[PDB]
Amino acid sequence: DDEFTQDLFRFLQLLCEGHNNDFQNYLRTQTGNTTTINIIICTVDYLLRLQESISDFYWYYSGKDV
Amino acid sequence: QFLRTDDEVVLQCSATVLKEQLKLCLAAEGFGNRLCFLEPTSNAQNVPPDLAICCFTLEQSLSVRALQEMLANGHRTLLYGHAILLRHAHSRMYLSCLTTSRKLAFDVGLQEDATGEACWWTMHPASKQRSEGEKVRVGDDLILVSVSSERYLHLSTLQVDASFMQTLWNMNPICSCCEEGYVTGGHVLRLFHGECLTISAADSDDQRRLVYYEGGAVCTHARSLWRLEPLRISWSGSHLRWGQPLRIRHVTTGRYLALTEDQGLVVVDACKAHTKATSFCFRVSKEKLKRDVEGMGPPEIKYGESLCFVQHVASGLWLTYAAVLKKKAILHQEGHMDDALFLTRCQQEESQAARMIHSTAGLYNQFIKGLDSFSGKPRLPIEAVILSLQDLIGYFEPPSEELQHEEKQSKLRSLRNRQSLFQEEGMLSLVLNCIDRLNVYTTYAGEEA
C-alpha cells in the first residue's frame, strides 16, 4: 500500500519537525552506534523509484492523452 | 568518472579466451562489413593492435519506456538500464542486432539506420550496488541486452553473438569533446613541411617504404595523413602534449611507423612495429629535456599555426628531411630548424574515406589470390566482398536530382572529392586486375560459388 508509504514518510517527517538538527545529523551518521546509516539517502532513493514510476506513467499515458 | 552522452569510448570486454589472456575490444570495421568480430587493444608491445575500428560513440541512453514513444512517430548522463543508441564513428553504421544464423541466437551487426529497436541495448549490471538507473562510471562492467531480439550481448568463444549467455563489456575512455586548436590521438592529421609528410602512392613492389615531405596536391592525398596513437589505451583520444609519448599508425595502409634507423626513418609493416620503436613524441623546439594525464587530457597544440617537432625515444633521434623534389624524412639529432610540422586536423570525411580505402585494399587481395588459387585447377571471400562492392557503390553515387542546386552541387563536390581520393591510390586498377582474372569463364571453375 502506497498509502502506507505516505504515512510512513510523513512519520519520518515528524521525526524532524521542530528542526532538531542534532537528530537529523544523527540520522545522517548515527554516531552513537558503531554502525552508520543515512536514512535520508534512502528516502531519496525512494523518491527516485517513485519518480521512475511517475515517469513510466508518463510514457504510457502521454500517448493516450485522456 | 561519469560517462556522459556524446563521448567516445570503446567497449573493452575482459575477453580471456577461456584460458589466456588478451584484453581485446569489440570491433567491427563498418563499411562492407555488417558482421561483428573482435580486435586486440591490450598487446602494446611487438604485435600492436588496431584501435581505430573499436571507437564506439555514445548517443542516447534513453529509457526503455521512453524509447517506446519516440518509436511512435543532448549530453544526458548515461544511466544503467536504458536502451542505448551506439555507433561505429567511422561508418555511422550504428551498432545493432540482426537476424542471421551465427545455435539459435542472432548475430549482432552494424546497420546504418537510426530506425528501429535494433540499435538500442538495455543494460543489466550484475552488481545490484549499481542498480539500473545509475550513472555509468569509467570502465564499468555490463551485460547489454537487445531491445530488438531481446538477446543478451555475448562473446562466443573469435565468434560474436547475441545469446542468453552474458559477457561483460567495459567502457574504456578515449576522448571527450576535442577542442579546435587542440590536437588529439586516435585522430588523423597532416604533418606539414610548409607541403607535408607523405609516402609514395605507387603501392607497388616498393611497399611505400620511401618517406617524403612534399608540396602541392599530395597534401590533399590520403597518403599524407597520419593517425597518431598516444602510448595509452585509455583516453587515447585525450588532448595531446608536446612531450607525451605516442604510436604513429599510417592511415592509407594502416601501418605503424617504427624505429628502422636504416633509411633514417621509414614506413614499416604493422607486424615489425613496436610500442618501443614507435615511441615518437612532440616537442616545441629542438630540445633534449607527469604521465599519463587521464580524465580529459589538457588542451595544448594547435590544429594550425603552432609547430611541433617529433623527437623519438628508442633512438632519441629527431625527425628531419634527408636533404625529383622528393626531400625525405629521417631520424638524426639535427637536420635543420625547418621540420615545420604546423599540425592541422584531418577532415571527417577524409578519414572515413581513407580508412575505408585501406579496408578495401585490405580485403580484395585475399579475394584475388583465392580466386586465382583454383585457376591452377580448371574444371574465397565471395559475399563479403560483394558487400564491399555494393557498399562502395552506395558510398559513390550522384547527388539527388531532386534536390536543391546548392546541395546538389556541394554534394557533387563531395563526390568529386571522394572519387579523387579513392583514385589517389588507384585501387580501381586492382579492380581492373580482378576483371582481368575473372571473365575467362564461359559460365565454371569451382562449379559452386
From Swiss-Prot, chain B:
UniProt subcellular location: Sarcoplasmic reticulum membrane
Coiled coil regions, renumbered to chain: none
UniProt domain MIR: residue ranges: 75-126, 133-174, 180-231, 237-296, 298-347
Tissue expression remark: Detected in skeletal muscle (at protein level). Fast- or slow-twitch skeletal muscle.
PTM comment, free text: The N-terminus is blocked. Channel activity is modulated by phosphorylation.
Resulting phenotype, G304R: Decreases threshold for channel activation by K(+), caffeine and 4-chloro-m-cresol. Decreases inhibition by Mg(2+)
Domain notes: The calcium release channel activity resides in the C-terminal region while the remaining part of the protein constitutes the 'foot' structure spanning the junctional gap between the sarcoplasmic reticulum (SR) and the T-tubule. Pore opening is mediated via the cytoplasmic calcium-binding domains that mediate a small rotation of the channel-forming transmembrane regions that then leads to channel opening.
Function: Cytosolic calcium-activated calcium channel that mediates the release of Ca(2+) from the sarcoplasmic reticulum into the cytosol and thereby plays a key role in triggering muscle contraction following depolarization of T-tubules. Repeated very high-level exercise increases the open probability of the channel and leads to Ca(2+) leaking into the cytoplasm. Can also mediate the release of Ca(2+) from intracellular stores in neurons, and may thereby promote prolonged Ca(2+) signaling in the brain. Required for normal embryonic development of muscle fibers and skeletal muscle.
Further comment found in the protein's record: Binding of [3H]ryanodine indicates that the heterozygous channel is activated by Ca(2+) concentrations 4-fold lower than normal. Single-cell analysis of cotransfected cells shows a significantly increased resting cytoplasmic Ca(2+) level and a significantly reduced luminal Ca(2+) level.
Subunit and partners: Homotetramer. Can also form heterotetramers with RYR2. Identified in a complex composed of RYR1, PDE4D, PKA, FKBP1A and protein phosphatase 1 (PP1). Repeated very high-level exercise decreases interaction with PDE4D and protein phosphatase 1 (PP1). Interacts with CALM; CALM with bound calcium inhibits the RYR1 channel activity. Interacts with S100A1. Interacts with FKBP1A; this stabilizes the closed conformation of the channel. Interacts with CACNA1S; interaction with CACNA1S is important for activation of the RYR1 channel. Interacts with CACNB1.
Family the UniProt entry places it in: Belongs to the ryanodine receptor (TC 1.A.3.1) family. RYR1 subfamily.
Protein name stated in the entry: Ryanodine receptor 1
Gene from which the chain derives: RYR1
